[PDB]
Amino acid sequence: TKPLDGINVLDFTHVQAGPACTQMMGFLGANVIKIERRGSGDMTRGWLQDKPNVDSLYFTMFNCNKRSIELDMKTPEGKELLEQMIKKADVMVENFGPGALDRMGFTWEYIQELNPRVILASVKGYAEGHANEHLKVYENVAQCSGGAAATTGFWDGPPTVSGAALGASNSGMHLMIGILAALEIRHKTGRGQKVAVAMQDAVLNLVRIKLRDQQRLERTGILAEYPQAQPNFAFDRDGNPLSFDNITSVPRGGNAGGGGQPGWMLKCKGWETDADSYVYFTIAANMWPQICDMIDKPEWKDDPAYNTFEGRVDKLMDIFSFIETKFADKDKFEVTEWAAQYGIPCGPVMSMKELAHDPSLQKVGTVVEVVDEIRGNHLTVGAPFKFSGFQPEITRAPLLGEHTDEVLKELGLDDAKIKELHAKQVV
Amino acid sequence: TKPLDGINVLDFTHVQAGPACTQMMGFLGANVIKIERRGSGDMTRGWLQDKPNVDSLYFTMFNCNKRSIELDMKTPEGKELLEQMIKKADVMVENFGPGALDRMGFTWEYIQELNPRVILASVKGYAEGHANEHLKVYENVAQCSGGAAATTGFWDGPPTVSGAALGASNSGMHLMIGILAALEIRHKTGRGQKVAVAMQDAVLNLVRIKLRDQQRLERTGILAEYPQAQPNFAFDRDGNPLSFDNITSVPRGGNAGGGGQPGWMLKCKGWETDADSYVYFTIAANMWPQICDMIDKPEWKDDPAYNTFEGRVDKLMDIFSFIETKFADKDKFEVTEWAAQYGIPCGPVMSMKELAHDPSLQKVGTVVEVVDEIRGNHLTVGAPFKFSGFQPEITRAPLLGEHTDEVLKELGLDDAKIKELHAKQVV
Numbered sequence: 001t002k003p004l005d006g007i008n009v010l011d012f013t014h015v016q017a018g019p020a021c022t023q024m025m026g027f028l029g030a031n032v033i034k035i036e037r038r039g040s041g042d043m044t045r046g047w048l049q050d051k052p053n054v055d056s057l058y059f060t061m062f063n064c065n066k067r068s069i070e071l072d073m074k075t076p077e078g079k080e081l082l083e084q085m086i087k088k089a090d091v092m093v094e095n096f097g098p099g100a101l102d103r104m105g106f107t108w109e110y111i112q113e114l115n116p117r118v119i120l121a122s123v124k125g126y127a128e129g130h131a132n133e134h135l136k137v138y139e140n141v142a143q144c145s146g147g148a149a150a151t152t153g154f155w156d157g158p159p160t161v162s163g164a165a166l167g168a169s170n171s172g173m174h175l176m177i178g179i180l181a182a183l184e185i186r187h188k189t190g191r192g193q194k195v196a197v198a199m200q201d202a203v204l205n206l207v208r209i210k211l212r213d214q215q216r217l218e219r220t221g222i223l224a225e226y227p228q229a230q231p232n233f234a235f236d237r238d239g240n241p242l243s244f245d246n247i248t249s250v251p252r253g254g255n256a257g258g259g260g261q262p263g264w265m266l267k268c269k270g271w272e273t274d275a276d277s278y279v280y281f282t283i284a285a286n287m288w289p290q291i292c293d294m295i296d297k298p299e300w301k302d303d304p305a306y307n308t309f310e311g312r313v314d315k316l317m318d319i320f321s322f323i324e325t326k327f328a329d330k331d332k333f334e335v336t337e338w339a340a341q342y343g344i345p346c347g348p349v350m351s352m353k354e355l356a357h358d359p360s361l362q363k364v365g366t367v368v369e370v371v372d373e374i375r376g377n378h379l380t381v382g383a384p385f386k387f388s389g390f391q392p393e394i395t396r397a398p399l400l401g402e403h404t405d406e407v408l409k410e411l412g413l414d415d416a417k418i419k420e421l422h423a424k425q426v427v
Numbered sequence: 428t429k430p431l432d433g434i435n436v437l438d439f440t441h442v443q444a445g446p447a448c449t450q451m452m453g454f455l456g457a458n459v460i461k462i463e464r465r466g467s468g469d470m471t472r473g474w475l476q477d478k479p480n481v482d483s484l485y486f487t488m489f490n491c492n493k494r495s496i497e498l499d500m501k502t503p504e505g506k507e508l509l510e511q512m513i514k515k516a517d518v519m520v521e522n523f524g525p526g527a528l529d530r531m532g533f534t535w536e537y538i539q540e541l542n543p544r545v546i547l548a549s550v551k552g553y554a555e556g557h558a559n560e561h562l563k564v565y566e567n568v569a570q571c572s573g574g575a576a577a578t579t580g581f582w583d584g585p586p587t588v589s590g591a592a593l594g595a596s597n598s599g600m601h602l603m604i605g606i607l608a609a610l611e612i613r614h615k616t617g618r619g620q621k622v623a624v625a626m627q628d629a630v631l632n633l634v635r636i637k638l639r640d641q642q643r644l645e646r647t648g649i650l651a652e653y654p655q656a657q658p659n660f661a662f663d664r665d666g667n668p669l670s671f672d673n674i675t676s677v678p679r680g681g682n683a684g685g686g687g688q689p690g691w692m693l694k695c696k697g698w699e700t701d702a703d704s705y706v707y708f709t710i711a712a713n714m715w716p717q718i719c720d721m722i723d724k725p726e727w728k729d730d731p732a733y734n735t736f737e738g739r740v741d742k743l744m745d746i747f748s749f750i751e752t753k754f755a756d757k758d759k760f761e762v763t764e765w766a767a768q769y770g771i772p773c774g775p776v777m778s779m780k781e782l783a784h785d786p787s788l789q790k791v792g793t794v795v796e797v798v799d800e801i802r803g804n805h806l807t808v809g810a811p812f813k814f815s816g817f818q819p820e821i822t823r824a825p826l827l828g829e830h831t832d833e834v835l836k837e838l839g840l841d842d843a844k845i846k847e848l849h850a851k852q853v854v
């Protein structure tokens with residue numbers, strides 16, 4: 001049935017990276033118990049609420065398929081409870097600041113004593129052993145540390161952050177790989193391991209293609225697929241020409257192709273008024289004759305100035321600019337359909353509004369309406385992996401401390417000691 | 428002990444998404460057999476080579492810890508060899524175009540019959556059942572379909588692709604979660620499943636915070652942390668005020684915080700001559716007093732127009748301009764060390780040049796020098812998950828069909844039959 005049926009997750013996480021991981025584990029069937037601060041809970045509860053007093057969509061979209069217990073881990077009775085919970089857990093996940101869990105008395109060595117089967121899984125900004133090992137980091141700092149910011153945006157503008165959570169959710173998904181790898185180890189050794197993912201490293205893994213470019217640049221002095229390789233195309237903000245004669249670190253290439261075949265972001269009808277009225281259009285090496293037919297340039301088919309990648313290096317941006325011309329009177333969906341007739345990789349810039357109400361994504365279970373009778377229903381992203389013999393069942397995020405008493409009862413505490421913990425402000 | 432030791436991977440993949448997944452499985456100890464086209468192999472081999480007739484860095488950086496067999500699969504004898512490899516495989520991974528593997532006769536339904544234990548893992552551009560199910564997709568096309576492009580960049584510029592491989596490597600890592608989940612299913616059921624990750628969906632999962640924003644926007648008409656909600660800060664192409672009055676889909680917010688706490692991209696010393704001389708600086712609500720001490724402005728501690736998130740929105744960018752003037756004569760790293768004193772999430776935009784040769788990343792095994800005695804050494808990104816009881820051993824990428832005869836001998840075929848397959852042009 002579900003991949004992680006019977007896996008108990010002691011979930012210390014807050015914000016995005018850690019909760020994304022444990023939420024997805026929960027979607028795949030894990031029993032996730034989320035430990036939260038007494039009173040305020042996970043910071044995302046009160047972060048950019050759409051309705052006052054109601055848990056924000058930040059919290060609900062990252063904390064479905066979880067139960068919530070409030071715990072003051074600074075008290076000694078809270079530490080005792082944690083020890084009992086660790087003994088029943090298959091994996092513990094934390095994304096507190098560097099050394100925080102250690103300071104509570106729960107180092108890797110002490111956790112192994114408590115449960116030689118448990119997997120400790122951790123997200124940090126930087127890897128253990130790194131000069132910046134002790135720094136706290138959020139999303140965009142990690143994007144900067146891992147190379148994405150330096151290689152995203154335009155040559156005449158600043159390092160640019162991605163809207164996608166390259167630092168946070170991406171780190172959580174990488175940690176999920178780590179946890180699952182560690183569970184596979186455990187089938188063989190009967191033992192738990194520590195796994196850790198640094199945000200910088202999760203970003204750098206996605207920026208692998210730019211480390212390719214850096215070496216190419218060091219070795220050859222040019223990146224022929226970049227706009228800057230076209231003579232007199234690219235200029236900095238003072239109007240100085242940009243060529244690879246003077247570039248020693250991988251530059252921003254605007255909307256160039258990356259690890260795909262060469263492409264660009266082309267305007268469609270209504271771009272002046274509609275921010276998302278664009279398509280991405282690829283000029284792949286095997287598709288020149290098809291492109292020539294589409295744009296009625298038969299004379300370009302057999303001209304060596306146009307029909308190889310190498311011949312196009314000096315003029316690719318002019319070609320894109322001319323192709324764009326054919327899209328002036330067509331919206332992004334019409335251009336997408338037109339390009340599809342030729343087999344040309346090409347698709348629209350989908351707006352978040354379009355994505356939220358797209359029938360396909362709802363049909364395939366990627367955009368999902370969560371039933372929440374307390375807060376009102378909301379949309380979330382479901383499982384991005386589709387399985388032949390299993391469907392996720394997404395349930396609403398917990399209220400703060402909703403399952404405190406439920407969870408304490410499962411640990412074997414009697415009614416009297418639960419009352420006692422409420423009074424002592426442990427729970 | 429390696430997590431995926433003894434796991435046999437039949438690897439049809441090419442380009443980036445699929446090969447990233449199987450390379451990373453190989454780093455964790457999997458036995459990866461890469462099937463490739465005769466003569467040219469994986470299209471990355473000849474893609475932007477840095478030396479003629481030598482496998483490109485695109486190829487080597489995505490195909491370490493793999494062996495290579497050439498195989499003409501559109502031949503009767505090639506199909507027979509595949510059947511035999513499938514019987515010995517734990518997982519098959521492919522990222523050909525829609526229906527390609529199906530058309531070779533290897534539908535999921537037939538694969539199950541051949542080996543009821545094997546997992547079929549597949550990356551596609553769009554999910555099965557989607558209206559665009561049948562389209563071919565590279566990297567940035569998926570960035571556009573999944574909402575990242577629409578929400579990346581600036582309000583007065585185009586949709587912008589991330590330099591990070593949101594579409595390709597990101598899908599590969601998601602597929603890896605899917606495969607490891609399926610291996611966990613199999614311990615229970617004794618049976619394999621099909622797992623698929625659509626590139627659109629892997630992008631959307633990282634763009635979850637922007638679907639949060641889309642709903643906040645639908646419910647309230649405003650996103651208070653976005654630049655457009657500061658009066659008379661943002662302007663359209665036509666010098667004219669921007670506000671949320673007429674914004675119905677999540678806009679581009681330049682270098683705003685996203686899913687981290689509010690921040691911006693701030694110039695440091697050398698920014699006109701050095702494209703990456705910047706830090707990202709986070710104003711976390713948590714740490715407003717710690718910030719006022721470093722700014723040399725303690726007047727803002729008590730001012731309620733300066734000391735809440737709600738008080739700060741009408742001039743967030745004025746504060747960032749002020750914090751920026753304090754960095755005007757300190758480089759990236761000086762500013763980062765300064766900020767570390769107060770525990771403020773603040774870090775440098777790391778250039779690819781700095782990352783490629785950073786001592787810390789090499790020490791922690793995140794950037795790795797591969798000993799390649801055929802081609803000369805190169806760098807690569809290692810495993811971004813660090814484990815207490817296991818170290819990856821990265822070995823060089825295979826030459827085309829280097830392991831053909833070796834792989835064919837492991838299948839129990841005699842030396843004369845191997846010569847026949849060579850002569851029949853199937854291998």
Ligand SMILES: CC(C)(COP(=O)(O)OP(=O)(O)OC[C@H]1O[C@@H](n2cnc3c(N)ncnc32)[C@H](O)[C@@H]1OP(=O)(O)O)[C@@H](O)C(=O)NCCC(=O)NCCSO
Binds near residue numbers: 016037038095123
């Ligand atoms: C996200 C963040 C920057 C937030 O930092 P922060 O606002 O300063 O919180 P923090 O440093 O994690 O926690 C502060 C302390 O409260 C404690 N704490 C957390 N939950 C607690 C509870 N229920 N009871 C008692 N204490 C608790 C911690 O032990 C920590 O202890 P110290 O005072 O000894 O350092 C930081 O947690 C971090 O670097 N996380 C690791 C990487 C990560 O995942 N970051 C981002 C996730 S999403 O972008």
Ligand SMILES: CC(C)(COP(=O)(O)OP(=O)(O)OC[C@H]1O[C@@H](n2cnc3c(N)ncnc32)[C@H](O)[C@@H]1OP(=O)(O)O)[C@@H](O)C(=O)NCCC(=O)NCCSO
Binds near residue numbers: 463498563
């Ligand atoms: C990446 C790409 C767009 C490339 O497209 P392409 O260059 O036209 O190749 P393709 O469509 O995968 O394969 C073409 C054909 O050759 C075949 N082929 C591949 N290897 C073969 C072999 N060794 N022997 C015989 N045939 C082979 C396929 O079966 C396919 O057959 P059809 O004619 O029946 O479609 C496409 O494979 C794709 O959409 N993949 C899925 C999404 C993905 O992973 N994208 C890229 C990731 S990185 O950016």
